[PDB]
Every structure is written in C-alpha cells, then in structure tokens.
Amino acid sequence: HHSGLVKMSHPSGDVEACMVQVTCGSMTLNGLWLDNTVWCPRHVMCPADQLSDPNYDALLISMTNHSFSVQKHIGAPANLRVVGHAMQGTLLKLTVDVANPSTPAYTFTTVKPGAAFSVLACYNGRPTGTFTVVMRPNYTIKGSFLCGSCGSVGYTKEGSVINFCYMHQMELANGTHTGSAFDGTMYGAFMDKQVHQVQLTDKYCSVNVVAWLYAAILNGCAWFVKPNRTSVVSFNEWALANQFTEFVGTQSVDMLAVKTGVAIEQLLYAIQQLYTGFQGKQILGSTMLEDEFTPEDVNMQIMGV
Amino acid sequence: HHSGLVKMSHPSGDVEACMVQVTCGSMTLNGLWLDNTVWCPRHVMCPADQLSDPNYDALLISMTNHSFSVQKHIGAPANLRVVGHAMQGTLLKLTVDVANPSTPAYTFTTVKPGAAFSVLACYNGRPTGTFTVVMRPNYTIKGSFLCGSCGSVGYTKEGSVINFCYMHQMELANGTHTGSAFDGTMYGAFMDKQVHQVQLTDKYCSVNVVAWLYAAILNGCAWFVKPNRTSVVSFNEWALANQFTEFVGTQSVDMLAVKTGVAIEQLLYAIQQLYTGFQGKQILGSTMLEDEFTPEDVNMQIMGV
Ligand SMILES: *[C@H](O)[C@H](C[C@@H]1CCNC1=O)NC(=O)[C@H](CC(C)C)NC(=O)OC[C@@H]1CCC(=O)N1Cc1cccc(Cl)c1
Ligand SMILES: *[C@H](O)[C@H](C[C@@H]1CCNC1=O)NC(=O)[C@H](CC(C)C)NC(=O)OC[C@@H]1CCC(=O)N1Cc1cccc(Cl)c1
Ligand SMILES: [Mg+2]
Numbered sequence A, B: 001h002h003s004g005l006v007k008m009s010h011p012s013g014d015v016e017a018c019m020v021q022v023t024c025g026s027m028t029l030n031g032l033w034l035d036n037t038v039w040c041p042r043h044v045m046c047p048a049d050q051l052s053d054p055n056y057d058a059l060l061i062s063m064t065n066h067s068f069s070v071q072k073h074i075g076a077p078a079n080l081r082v083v084g085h086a087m088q089g090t091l092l093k094l095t096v097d098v099a100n101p102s103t104p105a106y107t108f109t110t111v112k113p114g115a116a117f118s119v120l121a122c123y124n125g126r127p128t129g130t131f132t133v134v135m136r137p138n139y140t141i142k143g144s145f146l147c148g149s150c151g152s153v154g155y156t157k158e159g160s161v162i163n164f165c166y167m168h169q170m171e172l173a174n175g176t177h178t179g180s181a182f183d184g185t186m187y188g189a190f191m192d193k194q195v196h197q198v199q200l201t202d203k204y205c206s207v208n209v210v211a212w213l214y215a216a217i218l219n220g221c222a223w224f225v226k227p228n229r230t231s232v233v234s235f236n237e238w239a240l241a242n243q244f245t246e247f248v249g250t251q252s253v254d255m256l257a258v259k260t261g262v263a264i265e266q267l268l269y270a271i272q273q274l275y276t277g278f279q280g281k282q283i284l285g286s287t288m289l290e291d292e293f294t295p296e297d298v299n300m301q302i303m304g305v
C-alpha cells in the first residue's frame, strides 16, 4: 500500500525565469536575477590557483564592472550589462542595467533544520532539474549537484511569493551539500574555501519522524501505536543521548494529532522503541525511521490541507 | 555517505504554461493546451450519479461547444472559447479558438515499465507541485494526487522537446495511481469508471536495481560485488519465479559497467543473494533493494553524462 507521499517540489517556472549565467575570467556559474540585481557566489572571482585560500576582499577590489558577464539564455534571452558590484558575505550582488521583467514577488529567508525547500539545479545558467530536500541538523542538504551547479537556488513559496533561502556553494566529503542564505552567511560553520572542513554530526529530525508516523496512521498502519506515552521533556532528554533533534511541536503536528486521535506523546514513545529495532516489521514499506517528510508535507499531500 | 541521488524532475515551466481548467456542468478538472487543442479526461462529462457506469458515447453526443468552459489562470490569463469537441479513447480533444502562444516543441509517447517521468500536479488549472515517478510493471505509479488532480500531466524531455506521456485519471485501492497516454488508452487494463478493478501484481524493476547497485559502486560501496556471475538468461528464469521483471540491458547500463569495471552478470548474481536478505548490512543507507532510480538517473546525476 503506497502512502501517497512523494518528494514534492514547487513548480519551478517562476524561478527558471530568474536564472542567468555569470562569468568572471575563467570561472562561470549561475546567478539569480531579481529586479536590477544579480546574486551569485563570490567564488566566481577566484582563480583556480587560489580556491583553497582566496582573499575575497582583494579579489573584490581587483574587479571592475567590465569583469563580469551576465547572460540569460532561455525564454527571454539577454546579455545584461553590469553597472555595479558589491559583496555581501559569501555572495556577490551585481547591479545590472535592466530590471528582470519576470521578477516574481519574493522575500529572502533562512531555512531551519528539518524544514523542506525546493531546489532548481542549473548549469551554465540553464535549469536542468528540480528536487526537494530538508535542511539537515548539521546544516547540509542531501542534494544532487555537480561541477558548474553553484548559484543554483533553493526556495519555498507562500501563495505567489517566492522565499529564496539557499544558493548552492559546495560539496562535502560525505557527499552532502551546503550553500549560503541571501544575507551572505553560509549555513552552518562552513566557509567558501576549497579546504576540507569539520562537518557536524547529523541527527534524526524528530518532528519529521513524528510526521511520518502520522502518515502511516493516516494510511491504516498503526501497529506501533500503544497506550504508552513519553512526555516531550522526557523524550528530549533521550534525544540528546540518541542522536535525535529535540522535539518542538507545531500547529501542523497538532492537526495530525487531532485528525488521527493519536497523541504526540504516544508517537514519542513509539520512536524510542522503534529506534531499537522494527522487529522485522515495516512502516510504509520501510524498516527504518524516515525523517525526510515534514508535518506540512503530510497535511498537504494526504489530508489536502 | 550520501549517494548524490535525488528524485529529480524536469523544470516544469514550459508545462505550467500549458495548464488550463476545464469545466463541464458540475465537474471541473485540468486540461493541457497545445496549439488549438485542449486535452482533458473524458470523465469531466460524467455526472456524479453515473461515474460507476458512464455511457461515454451518449455523453459525448449530448455535448455542445457551449458545454465546455476552458480557463487559463496564471501568467497569461484567458477564457478560451471551445469551437469543437471530440473523444479519443479516455480523453477529450477540445478545439479552441486561440492557439497557445507558449506551446513548447512537443511529442506524445507511451512510457514503459521502469522508465521515469515527471509529473506536474495541478488543481483547478493551477500547478501546485512537481514530482517524478517510475511506471510500475503493473501500469500504476506511486504518485501523490487528490480530488481535483485529474488532467495533471506527466512528461519526459529530450533537449527542448517535451514528450507528454501521462494524463492522470484515477487512484487504485492500494493508494497507487493510473491514467492515460495521449492516444487515449489507459495504461494497463484499467478503465475510466468508478468501480473497483483488478490490479496486476507489481514486481521489482531489475534494470533499475542494477542501476542502483552501480550507483553504490560509484560511491565506493561494493561489499556485495563478488567474482560470481549469473547470466541474463539464467537471471531471467529466476526473476519469473521471484517477482522481478526480466532484465534487458541497454547502452545506459553498459556505460555503468564500463565506468565501474563491474559486469552486469556480477550484479545479477548479487541481486539473487541480496533478495534473500542483506545480512544486517546496508547499501546506500537502505536494507532493501531500490528500483526507483533508472540507469539514466545514475549516469546523469552521478557521472554527469
Ligand atoms: C560550484 O559549482 C561547486 C559545486 C560542487 C562541485 C561538485 N559538486 C558540488 O556541489 N563548488 C565547488 O567546487 C567548491 C568551491 C569552493 C571555493 C567553495 N569547492 C568544493 O565544494 O570543493 C572543496 C570542498 C570544500 C569542503 C570539502 O571537503 N571539499 C573537498 C576538498 C577539500 C580540500 C581540497 C580539495 Cl581539492 C577538495
Ligand atoms: C480525478 O480528479 C480523480 C483523481 C483521484 C481522486 C483521489 N485521488 C485521485 O487520484 N479521479 C477520480 O475520482 C476517478 C474518476 C473515475 C471516473 C475514473 N475515480 C477514482 O479513482 O475512484 C474510483 C476508483 C477506480 C478504481 C478503484 O478501485 N476505485 C475506487 C472505487 C471503486 C468503486 C467505487 C468507488 Cl465509490 C470507488
Ligand atoms: Mg557525490
């Protein structure tokens, strides 16, 4: 029995119309064109012989408006003249002489661990694929990015407003990925330098495991539900010793509790038991806990909220 | 260690610009507007009191051009006047008086079991999400569709050409989904009537399991590779008794064999052993065989082909 859950991304068209290619010297990557600004990773300025220890302040001062080439390829092709440049943290803000006529309503936000967002993967300013990820507790994502993908963007959508939350920068040794928010800060403790870096421990996202257990109940799969309960405070002490995030309830989780009649604390107890082993049973076709679906995913995809 | 694989859909913008809402009486669902034609499921003509045994021939003859309302909501809003109507299998072909100015280059094709395609889920003519599925051996997909989603479309893309392959029609009792190709045939033995239907057995897609094992090797995970080999003919006899599809090699699989230096027949042997149990080990974080990634997915996402 299929749960009705899939990895569901936002439709990408509004963001596709904002992707451009940015070239500086021998480096090329993607940028995001909104109004008269093009955002891109600052390492586009870095020659390959300096990627391990760039002096971005000196690289910035070495630039002229003539140093940057910006091109839009699809739909409404254009070469965009750069008329100013500035650095914000790990991003460049290029000012261009044409305002993007397809600029959507937008904001910039930071995404938190456990929350999902959609990514538009792009190469040479051309969108090639879209996928959804959850921000991990260690501020990486389990993405799919190759050389040339930097400047690919991640976003959520509220109504017609696009909330841009991620610009892709790097791949870590364990195959995960990280990038910057549009305030220019890297997620986590990462730096935009080509050196090996400490990656913090990942953890199971407890709130998302709870969501998935609710999805199981909504599909008639409830063998793991017992009268037994663990309080949020007690579960959270356990979580710290067992590589789980501390649980913080939300209205979205509460809606699942009301619909199913199963209390959060019943599922916190179930998690503690299931973490020790599923005893040969499956939940929604899985023999391990799943944390890649959010309470909102379950509310939207199964309950049609 | 993350494999670098995600469920990767095509960018959806070109298809978003083709989605419309179609209403006939009390029924509303989605349609696809290409050139001067709008395709939609024929059950838009059916009143709720007849969904279990519609007489579609009589329903069709009962229609006039005045029976259909077609509306485009996003981007370039429009009410489209219907000037003709016809039925092709389980689809209606409505002729409208305006050609869609955003019609992409396109073809219609049928997708085969094991192959992946992208879906644009829509409600009331408004795109709401995108996801990717593989056509199952029993001609269902494991999608995410609710009331109002019929007429949502699935497609692949070759260069700039969109190959439309699926129009959504129904949900089966086990939570999976099916629909029609654009020749109007339903996938499988299904009928577009609101009655319970025999669903054929699903099977593991052997070629996709092979692909995933190659993805594991490309990530340094090869504990399951031994000198032992099973021939394609021998594996295929085994597959018939063990709920696997028969294996048919392709150039895409051969590219993985060349890159890794591991023969297909080594992985056919591994599958037979792994099907009996993983012995407490994991492959790419999983304790069961994975068949939801294609050889092309692995070539593109990991090898950048
Ligand atoms: C931008 O297009 C790419 C995207 C990468 C390429 C492969 N997949 C991706 O997601 N980004 C990079 O190439 C960055 C650029 C720096 C300036 C941020 N480099 C990168 O990710 O490689 C270095 C990474 C940094 C963390 C780490 O562990 N790295 C490996 C490493 C460390 C030290 C030396 C070397 Cl040669 C590699
Ligand atoms: C179109 O928007 C919907 C999409 C569905 C709704 C829920 N999720 C979806 O994917 N399609 C339908 O409602 C179809 C319409 C018919 C005319 C094709 N109906 C449908 O899928 O429900 C009936 C299905 C058919 C196979 C089956 O097992 N069904 C259950 C069933 C059987 C007999 C009677 C009843 Cl009331 C339901
Ligand atoms: Mg990798």
Ligand SMILES: [Mg+2]
Pocket: A002, A003, A004, B175
């Ligand atoms: Mg369901």
